[PDB]
Design an enzyme around this catalytic site. Structure first.
Site, PDB file in Angstrom:
ATOM      1  CG  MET A 275      29.882  17.097   8.602  1.00 37.03           C
ATOM      2  SD  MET A 275      30.229  15.343   8.411  1.00 37.03           S
ATOM      3  CE  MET A 275      31.866  15.239   9.113  1.00 37.03           C
TER       4      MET A 275
ATOM      5  CG  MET B 296      38.711  20.295  10.393  1.00 31.92           C
ATOM      6  SD  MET B 296      37.490  19.155  11.075  1.00 31.92           S
ATOM      7  CE  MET B 296      38.047  19.030  12.771  1.00 31.92           C
TER       8      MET B 296
ATOM      9  CB  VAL C 279      36.283  23.383   7.227  1.00 36.37           C
ATOM     10  CG1 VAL C 279      36.501  22.922   5.785  1.00 36.37           C
ATOM     11  CG2 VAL C 279      37.348  24.386   7.642  1.00 36.37           C
ATOM     12  CG  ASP C 280      33.855  19.407   9.050  1.00 37.69           C
ATOM     13  OD1 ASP C 280      33.383  20.367   9.690  1.00 37.69           O
ATOM     14  OD2 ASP C 280      34.490  18.470   9.582  1.00 37.69           O
ATOM     15  CB  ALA C 281      29.253  22.911   9.192  1.00 40.89           C
TER      16      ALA C 281
END
Lengths: 266, 77, 51, 77, 77, 77, 77, 77, 77, 77, 77, 76
Positions: free
Chosen positions: G63, G55, G58-60
């Site tokens: 962000m 996770m 995932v969001d890097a």
């Protein structure tokens, strides 16, 4: 002090470039348009890290015994074993080049990335005030050139292996015939093979540069925008993430280099 | 002037589409590869070779599209 | 309805026509009704209950 | 001013759509090929040869799309 | 006006599409990785290494768009 | 005469949508074809005929779109 | 001058796409995590660690996109 | 004049959406048909009959859109 | 006047994309949770706890998006 | 004037969206029926009648969209 | 007049996106609930209650979007 | 008059997105319904009830979108 955060961000994204011809310190306010102005900040930190790596590895290799291992020697024996195990997993040939190359890549890339964890303004403030240098940024990996030079060296090694172990005949054969093997597709085969071949090292170098650059800019934005009392609540959750990021990215660079060299050779 | 300025948007559209297509295709391919390597752990180096073989086919069109976008944003712009 | 057999290598445990059963399948509790599609599964230890 | 710029815009959208389609189609085809390879590893030399034929049909149309996009970019200018 | 804001919109397009593609592809890959790890809880290091290979392959190309968008925003605009 | 520039964009969108639809449809069909060949490798020449019969339908609309876009691009413009 | 309005729109698009990807990929990953935790309820602390591990990957990019959108909205505009 | 520029674009959008939807639906239906035919040979004519029955329903609105885009292009513009 | 009007569209796109992303991610996660609860009714209190643990990560970015959309709609207007 | 030029575009986009949705939904519905008929042919007519029942509801909104697009194109002009 | 003609599009975007998101999320949740009720018919009331529990979570934000779109359309005009 | 074509365009956008959602969600639902009927052929009348129950929820927002599209199209 009086400053616009936009310019604070501007300074940090600039490099102590210096003209090779005239030996003159470029300044961040006005960039000239001459090609041969080495960006000193990333390279200066970059070879320093390689020197530290070589010094430590020699300082342990010069004494290591098969007796009771020390607490200091154990980390180096572990990293040697990890690199050797990865190579033995993904390389079977006799070339003595592969393993030390991978070890150097892993350790040097890890060292370069580690610079990002440091406070963004510490070393630049020191260099500006104590010394007087116009600009400084201390993470070597954030340099596109350091990444692209390493990727192009790996691509040169891949070409050498394809010519020598794989063979130039076995290179023209693969380029022309594969993947469709028919003469109708041979012109298409050449284009596809060339595109993928050039895609691989560009992918390595630009992946590393993107990771380091997009971590450094996040740190710079966090420093420049938020008030001091509130910076920690967003800075700390990011450095913990970036530790795993730098470890993963050094591991990825090493392993992907190994994979490409093994696929070129065997 | 607007003429060159819009070229940046054109390259942006082209390379964003290329990136989404490549990322999704490679993600699906790698997911199938991971599941295959989880069913037959002894087989991993063969499946990995096959995965590289097919990935070299997948990326070619996204790679050339991104290269041409870079061309339009640097050589043209 | 369907004809339920309960048997072992040593003995026939039960035989008779059954309207529905409750049985613990390999991955979870399962209920069987007449005309159920062909199905094959191991059963974990526990009660099987019958009407 | 805006004639060549719009020519580049049209080439950009064309090549982006072509790259999206090619990447997604080859991803699906390669994922199913990988699964079939995983089921019977010794059959891979045949399944790979059939996958190459099918992937040629997959590649047929995004290549004329990309060729026309390159024509628009370079020749028409 | 037409100079800066169109560059900003182009960068936004680049770094929205790149985020979409990278997030969806990495989620797809991680789903199969986590599914494999539940089937064979011992083989986890090997499967996660293969996952790292595929994750690098996926992440490589969206980062091109990310870096180029940062460039377009700050160096150009 | 501004008439010419919009026609290239109109051809480009048509051909890109046709390429997306045809490539994704053919990939979906070929994936099941390859899985079926994996299951019953002796039936491959029959499944190839069935696959060709079905593929002749998938490309019905996409080939019309591609032809019409090519017509617009050259004859009309 | 009117130029200020477009920066809000570009930040809006970038952050909306970033949120779309950050939600959907995390949703898929969490769904697989829950499916795997249902099977082996004793392995939750390990699956939960690996879920966090992936996770983070995932969001890097979402962000990055969200931070750039915040910058564009507040600092620039 | 102004009429043909927008009329060609409208017809292009209509035919492109039609080619997207028809190709995707026929791909999914054909994939299920191929998986069933691989499952149970010797029932291929029955499954093909049913597949044709469904396909006749599938293409209907896509065929209406195709016909109306042809009408716009070659009667209205 | 456009400085007031355009801001509502910039918030509308944000509050559409955030809603689509949150709805799709929560739907997929809730579907997996429902299937796990259906298979293993004893574990419902545990699977619900883990579902609520994971769901707070999905909403992280879409809630930033919706809050910024409300801000753009009301404060700056 | 501009009125008809915009109205043809509105009818085109509406009918295109309707066709995409109807075709994909009917294809999924048909694919599930195909798998259910492949599993056990003794239930083919029953599933085929429920398929008609569901397909009746499927086309509900797409045909409203088609009719209103036809109205826009043929009576509003 | 000039002012009001654009608020109906601000309503249109919010309500279309909210309808798409809510409908697709509710469809996924209902599909999983129907699957679970097809596996174990006796648990149907409990599964129905859990589905009704989760459904209120699903359509929270889409209902905010529909409410604010109706507010705009019938109070801002 | 001048904004009317734009009114029609907004109505067309609403009625296209509503049709997209109302098609895809009901297709997804009907696939599971068909598979559950294919497993439990007796329970088909039982499952149809739940299918209609959830279909009532699925159409809820598409029908608002269609009614507002019709209002914009014909009532203003």
């Amino acid at each position: 002090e009086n400053m616009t955060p936009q310019d604070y961000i501007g300074h940090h994204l600039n490099n102590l470039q210096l003209d090779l011809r005239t030996f003159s310190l470029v300044d961040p306010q006005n960039p000239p348009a001459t090609f041969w102005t080495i960006n000193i900040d990333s390279m200066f930190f970059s070879v320093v890290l390689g020197l530290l790596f070589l010094v430590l590895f020699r300082s342990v290799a010069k004494k290591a015994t098969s007796g009771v291992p020390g607490k200091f020697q154990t980390a180096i024996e572990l990293v040697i074993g990890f690199v050797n195990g990865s190579v033995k997993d993904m390389y079977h040939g006799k070339s003595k080049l592969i393993a030390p190359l991978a070890l150097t890549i892993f350790v040097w890339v890890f060292l370069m990335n580690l610079m990002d964890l440091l406070p963004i303004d510490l070393l630049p403030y020191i260099a500006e005030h104590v010394l007087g240098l116009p600009a400084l940024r201390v993470v070597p990996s954030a340099d596109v050139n350091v990444t692209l030079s390493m990727a192009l060296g790996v691509f040169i090694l891949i070409l050498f292996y394809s010519i020598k172990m794989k063979g130039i005949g076995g290179f023209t054969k693969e380029l022309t015939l594969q993947p469709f093997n028919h003469w109708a597709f041979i012109p298409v085969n050449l284009i596809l093979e060339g595109v993928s071949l050039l895609s691989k090292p560009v992918s390595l170098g630009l992946r590393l540069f993107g990771n380091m650059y997009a971590g450094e800019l996040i740190f710079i934005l966090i420093a420049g925008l938020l008030p001091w009392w509130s910076q920690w609540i967003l800075n700390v959750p990011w450095a913990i993430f970036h530790i795993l990021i730098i470890t993963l990215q050094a591991f990825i660079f090493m392993v992907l280099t190994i994979v490409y060299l093994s696929m070129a050779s065997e | 002037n607007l003429n060159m300025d819009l070229l940046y948007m054109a390259a942006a559209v082209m390379m964003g589409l290329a990136a989404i297509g490549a990322a999704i295709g490679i993600g699906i391919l790698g997911g199938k590869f991971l599941e295959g390597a989880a069913r037959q752990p002894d087989l991993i180096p063969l499946l990995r070779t096959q995965f590289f073989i097919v990935m070299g086919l997948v990326d070619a069109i996204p790679m050339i599209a991104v290269g041409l976008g870079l061309y339009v944003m640097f050589a043209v712009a | 309805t369907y004809h339920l057999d309960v048997v072992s290598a040593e003995q026939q445990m039960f035989s008779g026509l059954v309207e529905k059963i409750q049985v613990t399948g390999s991955e979870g509790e399962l209920g069987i009704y007449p005309g159920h599609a062909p199905l094959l599964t191991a059963i974990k230890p526990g009660m099987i209950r019958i009407v």
